[PDB]
Design a protein around this ligand. Structure first.
Ligand SMILES: *[C@@H]1O[C@H](CO[C@@H]2O[C@@H](C)[C@@H](O)[C@@H](O)[C@@H]2O)[C@@H](O)[C@H](O)[C@H]1NC(C)=O
Ligand SMILES: *[C@@H]1O[C@H](CO[C@@H]2O[C@@H](C)[C@@H](O)[C@@H](O)[C@@H]2O)[C@@H](O)[C@H](O)[C@H]1NC(C)=O
Ligand SMILES: *[C@@H]1O[C@H](CO[C@@H]2O[C@@H](C)[C@@H](O)[C@@H](O)[C@@H]2O)[C@@H](O)[C@H](O)[C@H]1NC(C)=O
Ligand SMILES: *[C@@H]1O[C@H](CO[C@@H]2O[C@@H](C)[C@@H](O)[C@@H](O)[C@@H]2O)[C@@H](O)[C@H](O)[C@H]1NC(C)=O
Ligand SMILES: CCC(CC)O[C@@H]1C=C(C(=O)O)C[C@H](N)[C@H]1NC(C)=O
Ligand SMILES: CCC(CC)O[C@@H]1C=C(C(=O)O)C[C@H](N)[C@H]1NC(C)=O
Ligand SMILES: CCC(CC)O[C@@H]1C=C(C(=O)O)C[C@H](N)[C@H]1NC(C)=O
Ligand SMILES: CCC(CC)O[C@@H]1C=C(C(=O)O)C[C@H](N)[C@H]1NC(C)=O
Ligand SMILES: [Ca+2]
Ligand SMILES: [Ca+2]
Ligand SMILES: [Ca+2]
Ligand SMILES: [Ca+2]
Lengths: 384, 384, 384, 384
């Protein structure tokens, strides 16, 4: 049976802690991959954490830091990314994964920068390929893809990381690419889309790495018509970004004139929006989630909820979205969840290596207090 | 199929050894979580050990000792709480878990002391939340919850650990809270209830951490009517406690005028009772189980059985109750079992860390000899 | 479905290598239990290796050598007895296990020498108990028990290890003891029986630790009538033993006037017999298997086959029997298999610890060449 | 259900990366077997990596280098050959394995050089044996065997490694040998065949270790009629070999007059051929795959595709073939895949040990760019 995933996303008032893997703490002694770019995706029976290894273990000389050793692997949600619980998925230095109700689809991108290859896998074997079409680091979401009615959808970019690039959406059935579309977005920039199903469409909130401090939004229909623009809200959710009091929103255009960025996410809540962001404006530190009234449709600054998940003295990193399927929840709507990556090590910290751990939160019908579920590893390590 | 668990508890004459995990011994070299608060709960197909990790491994610098790293995880009964066999359950510094016949329900409490959040999980995803209602360390059983006819029941406390607090019982179906009751117990104190099903009711034997050296008893009906009082028996089963020869029982009121306490358990046996206690009156050392004639209904001192499980030269700790379901036993009654936690390390011992291991015993129809299945680890460890 | 196991044992011409776990070699670096007394038993879907741990790991200070830490655990056949693949079965310093077609039955004996308790487990929970009836180390086979038509059978001893003791056979269904018999064997001694099904009976070949250099044989019928005596063959198969040229067989009585012994096995082959023995007469070194014409029924010295499995420069240890069920083989007969335990460490070798590894061989229809699949570990280890 | 595997092999234009296990990198710290001779084979539900351990772990003193410790084990494709994920298959210093749709068949050869024994296992138990028929290292493919319509086929050699030997093909059903044929190949030499199903036949491409720099080809029909010769193509694919510009092909006879060799593979593509080879002509370094027009039927030098997988500065080793079954792909043809073994350590490198890791590629309908997915371990290791 294919998962329909045609339901509305649930409207939620707060987010509760789902899991914490403690991967780095455990890796001081246990056998745990150096990783980065973790993400969560669910099947009808379980949620799993996916991650890009460096082909090396914490506290080993090989952790010394797009290589040909990076692989996509997965564990059950809340397990550390440890060697002896890991399932191999793909050769990959960029990836996305999702389940259609019947099997896991994973996409791993590997190969040379000038001519990369994305291998689509379905049920644990390779089934199709997409080669780079613009010759400049073909790359993808680093979070869950989205499956509706047995067809799965994802976004890729090829081109410069800091100026205009090219963006395509793809649709597959049972691991075969059956459609694609080029997304026209002159002046805009899309990287590392965080996508989820809502009302029979794929809604993605992405990263502008060129000039925008606000985030791109892309809404794809099953026939690959789409709409694209920027998240309307009058609060900026990229990093780096400027102060909220100097920010004016835009539904159409990049605002803030700053480079760089970080993968993040948001969720539509009718006309409102939940948006995540690092607490710091200049560095990947802290993590808060804000609900903004009419923030999906207008340049609103009307904050109605805020929750802190990692405090501002502690490192954060990427964040991303996924949903709980109704075959697990028995709800009439899709429950929205997110993860946060907490990066440790170089160059900010004096270590030879870099890795991350994660925390996962899911939408519930009550507000939840602020706290900090930070990484908690004690650096440097023995190897340093 | 839901488990009925409407049967009488079996009347048993002695307890036989079920498992011993040797977690600390194995942790001198293997990759094993620092834990405390282990417990056992069964499904129709297996028994599992649940435990609260410290987000760190034995013999690692992170084991140096309510943190945001503590997690609830589980293994099959008698496996050490090791990294590579562990199943992740919840973010938690207090917990309870049980199976309804179809899936595992777990509850993990995390967050700040002033405003904690308990996340209910069902079949490995979050499904409901209970926030602190009194603002002072919302907390729960640290042992098995109890499911009857597809509805599961547990006890929580919010308030002071050493004076009057507030106590509630909750009922859920498929991970959704469908009822709750405040337990009126003015002058009494309830913590860390050890509960089991008997004759279509939930019977719990708890810890009074305020003034009582005797244990509270709470009997909850499926409609959330209840009765509450103290275990009648004229022998005290908390620690610390006074000498038995200075003790007089009470069915209604705390006796002994001493603070502090330890999680323990008892089982009704018609009108008699099996009660566990540490052998020492002043410290968590040794473990014995006593059967007292009419001890459930009267202030009896008539001991009819005694069995030692850990001798008085060796550390003990918490203990708790669970039952074997009839779909495993094919009996006409629910078999009563208990576990004992054996704590090692600081402050009693000169180590930087604290953890525990466990032994599990089940009720049988013959008396079993005394012995000592103690922890057996050799301290200090390399890290110390 | 219960396994019938009513078929004749296959008549076999040689034995082929099934598995080798390399447990000690791997334990120089990996996380592997110190063990002894390994054995193999099969279900309709797989063969497993069972073993008695010391509650400690190789190369750790706890391996420094009937304790309360010993446990029965199991892995798939040919896996090292490593922590992260092990299934917990029982608290045990002596054990037996077997499958009835539906579930695993295990028996673990633990407790004090004067008053030990054997806990019967069935499908991973305790289900019955046998307490010591003579007050002197209740003990059992250390190899597979035998199930026929859904009823399982095993042998136990209680009493002195070096003079007359007492011996009982037990029958269980679904983990409940439904029958027992005392085996009258005045002047004889039975320990550590190696049993298998043949033609709807249980045939066991045991160890005489009192005066015999020949092995006891016990044949039990489903109704617990039995016959008992000694393996007829005019070659001695215990260790220690005398030279074959000074040996005369007996069907009825212990021969050779020597103490001590080692667990071993034999298989009836119509009127012939396969018998295992250490190659050395004085120490547990080497391992050979001999087929003797009419050796089951007469004091024959007519050797018709010989195969070496461990050469005489290498350590051996216990050996034992099990059979392959027809639901795995699709044969019309039960295939006979054996294992050999290869003990390493103290007192023979200069180490602080003692453990073993294993090799498993199964009966085939062709002769197989001699070789040596010895342990191969390099002692002492780092810990020594 | 038996797998038919009667379909044509798919005609493919390039090969995409399936997996990379990073076994040596991970083994610098993790618990990973010293191996060599890895290979991949698939069932209807998954692909697995098989490998011959040395009965020892990387970075341990036992890794110090046909022993009686070598075993055949397997993991899921892309897992390192680590202790705690490994499934035991056979005692083996040479091996082959394949699935018939219902169960795994494995063959492990062990024993003395003069009189080796090959044990056939089926569904995880031994089921038949083949003893050496020529008394000189009985040996087999070190890659996948081939199953068609429920019958499985493989090739073995017995005799000298460097002059004329003897070669047989065998057929089994459910682990029982039901047929065999001696392959007449006077003047030729066959070792380490790489076989796959194509159009209801078994096509194998092998290693000539006597005089040929070209590879033998053997095509076996289900009734054990066969044809044998050499791969026609006018490019040599063994190592060592001469320059392509001095090479003329032959369909019938060994060409190049050089000894030694390396296990490799090729795939028929109608009348064309994909052939793998090391990039170096003198050493096992680099790996490229070439498609040659009419290379199956004529001495063609017409190269139409080339892809590099390991560059020529990096070590390679053995390579081999397998196919994806239609029950995984839902295609109308069998997808061709190969693996490459990347050997590290002595004598080329200054270490006490030798092991390998692997990369796996599968046939797709687009060309894929050149890259290098080399081993990447940093030698020497701590133990050296
Ligand atoms: C980590 O690596 C440092 C840099 O080494 C150099 O750069 C790398 C990329 C390689 O090409 C290597 O060959 C070069 O030597 C070292 O200088 C340093 O020793 C390393 N540190 C530790 C603790 O292993
Ligand atoms: C264990 O920790 C001891 C105390 O350290 C101090 O307190 C903790 C809570 C942290 O805030 C830390 O920053 C402080 O330094 C140490 O003094 C001691 O080194 C540690 N021992 C070992 C063996 O790791
Ligand atoms: C192994 O143990 C040796 C003997 O120790 C003594 O006997 C044991 C049974 C215990 O009671 C212990 O308390 C006694 O100290 C030691 O002398 C020796 O250090 C140990 N060796 C190693 C390498 O750990
Ligand atoms: C590795 O082994 C070297 C050679 O040792 C000798 O040869 C082997 C086959 C055995 O017979 C052994 O008994 C002999 O001693 C050693 O000389 C060397 O120490 C070893 N190296 C390390 C680092 O373990
Ligand atoms: C190459 C552009 C890309 C998106 C901005 O840079 C990413 C940014 C990163 C970052 O900002 O942390 C690390 C990513 N692993 C990297 N992606 C790849 C494929 O290299
Ligand atoms: C906070 C009061 C509570 C019950 C008395 O104290 C417990 C006692 C403990 C103890 O007495 O050993 C340790 C428990 N982990 C702690 N519980 C929590 C949630 O912190
Ligand atoms: C206690 C008598 C018994 C049988 C002879 O001794 C056995 C001999 C042993 C041996 O000879 O190797 C080791 C066994 N683990 C031991 N059994 C127990 C339960 O201790
Ligand atoms: C014995 C001849 C054989 C085929 C040429 O040599 C092989 C070559 C090898 C090699 O060339 O790398 C290593 C193999 N493990 C070895 N096979 C066996 C069974 O020893
Ligand atoms: Ca930006
Ligand atoms: Ca108290
Ligand atoms: Ca004897
Ligand atoms: Ca050659």
């Amino acid at each position: 049976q294919f998962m329909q995933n045609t339901e509305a996303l649930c409207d939620v008032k707060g987010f509760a802690p789902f899991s914490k893997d403690n991967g780095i703490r455990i890796g001081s002694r246990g056998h745990v991959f150096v990783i980065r770019e973790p993400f969560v995706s669910c099947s009808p029976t379980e949620c799993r954490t996916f991650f890009l290894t460096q082909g090396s273990l914490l506290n080993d000389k090989h952790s010394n830091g797009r290589s040909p050793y990076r692989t996509l692997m997965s564990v059950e949600i809340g397990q550390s990314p440890n060697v002896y619980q890991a399932r191999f998925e793909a050769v990959a230095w960029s990836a996305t994964a999702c389940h259609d109700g019947k099997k896991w689809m994973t996409i791993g991108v590997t190969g040379p920068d000038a001519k990369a290859v994305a291998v689509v896998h379905y049920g644990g074997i390779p089934t199709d390929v997409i080669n780079s079409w613009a010759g400049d680091i073909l790359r993808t979401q680093e979070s869950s893809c989205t499956c509706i009615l047995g067809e799965c959808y994802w976004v890729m970019t090829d081109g410069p990381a800091n100026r205009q690039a090219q963006y395509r959406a793809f649709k597959a059935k049972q691991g075969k690419i059956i459609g694609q579309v080029e997304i026209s977005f002159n002046g805009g920039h899309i990287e590392e889309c965080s996508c989820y199903p809502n009302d029979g469409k794929v809604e993605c909130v992405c990263r502008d790495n060129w000039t925008g401090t606000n985030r791109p939004v892309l809404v794809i229909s099953p026939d690959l018509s789409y709409r694209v623009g920027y998240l309307c809200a009058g609060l900026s959710s990229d990093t780096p970004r400027g102060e909220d009091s100097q920010f004016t929103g835009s539904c159409t255009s990049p605002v803030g004139n700053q480079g760089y960025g970080v993968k993040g996410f948001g969720f539509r809540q009718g006309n409102d929006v939940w948006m995540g962001r690092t607490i710091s404006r200049t560095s990947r530190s802290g993590f808060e989630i804000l609900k903004v009234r009419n923030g999906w449709v207008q340049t609103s600054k009307e904050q109605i909820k805020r929750q802190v998940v990692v405090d501002n003295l502690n490192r954060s990193g990427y964040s991303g979205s996924f949903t709980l399927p109704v075959e697990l929840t028995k709800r009439d709507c899709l429950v929205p969840c997110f993860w946060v990556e907490m990066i440790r090590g170089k160059p900010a910290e004096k270590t030879i290596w870099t890795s991350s751990s994660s925390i996962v939160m899911c939408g519930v019908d009550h507000e939840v207090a602020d706290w900090s579920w930070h990484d908690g590893a004690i650096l440097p390590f023995d190897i340093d």
